[PDB]
Ligand binder design. Sequence first.
Ligand SMILES: *[C@@H]1O[C@H](CO)[C@@H](O[C@@H]2O[C@H](CO)[C@@H](O)[C@H](O)[C@H]2NC(C)=O)[C@H](O)[C@H]1NC(C)=O
Ligand SMILES: *[C@@H]1O[C@H](CO)[C@@H](O)[C@H](O)[C@H]1NC(C)=O
Ligand SMILES: [Zn+2]
Length: 381
Amino acid sequence: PNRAPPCDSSQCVLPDCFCSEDGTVIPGDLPARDVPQMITITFDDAINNNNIELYKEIFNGKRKNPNGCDIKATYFVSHKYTNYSAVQETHRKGHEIAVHSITHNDDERFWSNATVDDWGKEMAGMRVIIEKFSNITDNSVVGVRAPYLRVGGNNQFTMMEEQAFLYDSTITAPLSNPPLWPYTMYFRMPHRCHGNLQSCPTRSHAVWEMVMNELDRREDPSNDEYLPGCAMVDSCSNILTGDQFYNFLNHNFDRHYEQNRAPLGLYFHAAWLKNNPEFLEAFLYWIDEILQSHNDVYFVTMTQVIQWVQNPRTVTEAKNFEPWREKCSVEGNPACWVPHSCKLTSKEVPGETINLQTCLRCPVNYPWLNDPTGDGHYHHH
Ligand SMILES: *[C@@H]1O[C@H](CO)[C@@H](O[C@@H]2O[C@H](CO)[C@@H](O)[C@H](O)[C@H]2NC(C)=O)[C@H](O)[C@H]1NC(C)=O
Ligand SMILES: *[C@@H]1O[C@H](CO)[C@@H](O)[C@H](O)[C@H]1NC(C)=O
Ligand SMILES: [Zn+2]
C-alpha cells in the first residue's frame, strides 16, 4: 500500500532522519578513525533487590568514560516486582530508564499480533507508571523494547509515533560485517526482518530504531565457520566460562571497532551476571581493561547514541559534547531516605500481593494494564 520507500539520502537529513542504503554508513560521513566507539550496556526486565546491589558493583562511580563522566547504561524496565525508588535512584545517577511493558506477557503471539491500543496500554502505560512512582518529570523515558524482542509490525510503531516515544530497540539485525548503525523508520529497513515469525513494520514511522546487531558467538572466528548470532548476551548458549565470555567480548568489540564503529550493543538480563560470578568477573575485568586502554571508547545510554547521531562529534570533540556530560558524576542523596513499601493488590493480577516501593504515598491498588496510576478510578465511557 503505502510501503516506505528505500533510503533517499536527499530527503533524509540530520538531525530528524538518518539512513543509508544498507545501514552501515557512518552518520555525517565522519571517517571511522575519528568516531568514538559507543557501547550501550542494557538491562532488561524488572529492577529490584535481585539486582540493585549488582548494579552498584558495576556502576560504582569510579568507572569513567574518557570525558571523566561515569559510564552509563540503559534499563528497559518491566513493571511487575519493580522497585520504583531504585528506578528513581538509577535515573538520578544518570542512567537511562526505558519501557519494557507492564505485563511482560508470556505469549509471543500476543505481541506479534497486538493492536495499536494493546501496544499503548503496555508501553505508554509503563511510561505512566515510571513517571509517577519514580517521580520523573523531564520527559526522558523515551525508549521501548518489547518482551522476547517480539516486533509488532506497523502497530507497534504507529503507537510509538502517536505516543511520542523517541526510539525502539526491538528489531534484530542478523550477524553482519560490518554491523549496522541505528536508523529512523521513515524509510524501508536496511535489512531483513529477522527471527521466528517476526512481524516487522513496512510503512513510514517517525521513530528511531536502535537496531540490535547479533553478536558473533564463535569461539575461534577463523576456523569455526557457521553459527547463528545472538542478540542477548545470555542467549549465546555456548558461552560457559569466564574465559569464553572474555574472548567473546574482545572479538565482537573488534568487529565494531575495526570496521564502521557502529554502536556495540551488550544486552543483558540482570540474573545471568549475578547467578554466574565467573561471568560478572570477566565482564568487569573486560570493562576495566577497555576503559584503561582506550581514550576513544564511550559507555553511553541509548538516548545518548541518538544525540550523537543527530550531531556527530569526533573523538576529540566528544570530551566536551554536552549531552554526554549530563549528570556527569552525580553524588548527592536519594530523593527519600526510607521509601514506602506498599503491599498492593489488584483484580487484574488475581490472587497475588505485590510489594511496590516508592517515595510517593502508596496508591490505592496495584498498577496494571487498565489502571497504570493505581488510583482505582472509574474510567469514562
Ligand atoms: C528499594 O529501593 C530503594 C532504593 O535503592 C532501597 O532503599 C534503601 O533502603 C535503605 C533501608 O531502607 C535505606 O537506608 C537507603 O537509604 C535506601 N537507599 C536509597 C538509594 O534510597 C530499598 O531498600 C529497596 N527495597 C526493596 C524491598 O527492594
Ligand atoms: C518530585 O520531585 C520534586 C523535586 O525533588 C519534588 O519537589 C516533588 O515533591 C516530587 N513529587 C512528588 C509527587 O513527590
Ligand atoms: Zn524481558
